[PDB]
Structures are given as C-alpha cells and as structure tokens.
Design a protein around this ligand. Sequence first.
Ligand SMILES: COC(=O)[C@@]1(c2ccc(C)cc2)CCNC1
Length: 182
Amino acid sequence: MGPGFDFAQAIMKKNTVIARTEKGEFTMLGVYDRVAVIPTHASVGEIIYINDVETRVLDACALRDLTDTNLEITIVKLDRNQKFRDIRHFLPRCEDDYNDAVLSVHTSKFPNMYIPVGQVTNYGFLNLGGTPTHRILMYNFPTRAGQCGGVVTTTGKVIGIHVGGNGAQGFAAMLLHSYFTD
Ligand SMILES: COC(=O)[C@@]1(c2ccc(C)cc2)CCNC1
C-alpha cells in the first residue's frame, strides 16, 4: 500500500525461503551467499527442507551473547546451488527502537502475508518459553502460531525475525550487522 509494504515486498520476493524442520514450517531469511537465519526453536539438524527440497546443512550456529544468554537466532549455511542477494547493508549496527515496522510471513499456511505492527520497543530481556533471552524487540500486535521466522522491517532496514508472542504482543530477535561479517 505504501513504502513500508514496498520494502517488505522486495525482501520477501528475493530473500526468503520456506524452511521445514521436524518442529514445523518457518519463514527463513537469506542474508548473503548460502547463509540464512531461523529461530533457534526450529531445532535445525543435518538435513532441512528448503521450498520442499532436501538440503544438507553445511553449518548451523545457535547465537548467544557474551553473558552466555540465548539470542534465539540460528545462522544456517545451506548446501544450495544458488546465492541470496546480499542484504547485509540493510542490517542495523546497534540495538535500537523503531517506528512503523512491518512483519512479513511466507509459508504454505500464510502466503504473501504483511502485517503493519507499528512502533517497535528495544525490550531487552524476555523469558521466552522458559528460556532467558536477550536483544528482544516488542510490538503491540496479537501475532499467532505460524508467524515464527517472519521478517521485521522498516523502510530501509531489516531489524529482526519474529520468535514468539503472548496473545497481545509479538517478540522478535534483533538482527545486527556484526552477526554476518566474514
Ligand atoms: C528491499 O528494498 C528494496 O530493495 C527497495 C526499497 C529500498 C529502500 C526503501 C526505503 C524502499 C524500497 C528498492 C526496490 N523496491 C524495494
């Protein structure tokens, strides 16, 4: 409808795949080369399905901060025959608050779904499904099962991936530029 949906649309059409693990179907954001992210609760193994194709996982790393606290981001390198568009220049360098964010989901159950979630708070600590977690963003939208891995963007920035909710608020793990240096 507007530049918010304009930005989200392009990230979705070129930088997302549908990932299936034993724990379900997730929106998976491709960041650069064969490197993508997914919520750690997807429990990525040695093999994953990417758009229903059997794919070997070459590496997978569940990120934690330097206090050894969960961040709920897993970085996956896929044995795929094609590279993602490099979107690392759209990642923020620091923890921040944001205005006017969109949460975008693409699965079998929710294809081409875009939700204007509005203001995003740097919430910080969250007890997420019993697991102490850091760098959580929060938005006041009643997000539901099947939105996990969903991409959170503002005009010009890719700021997080959806990892949970409480029925009234949704929670995303921050993406930071420093996660993807090489
Ligand atoms: C991923 O986003 C993009 O590449 C585009 C974009 C870039 C920046 C802003 C503020 C809006 C839209 C350029 C082409 N159409 C979407």
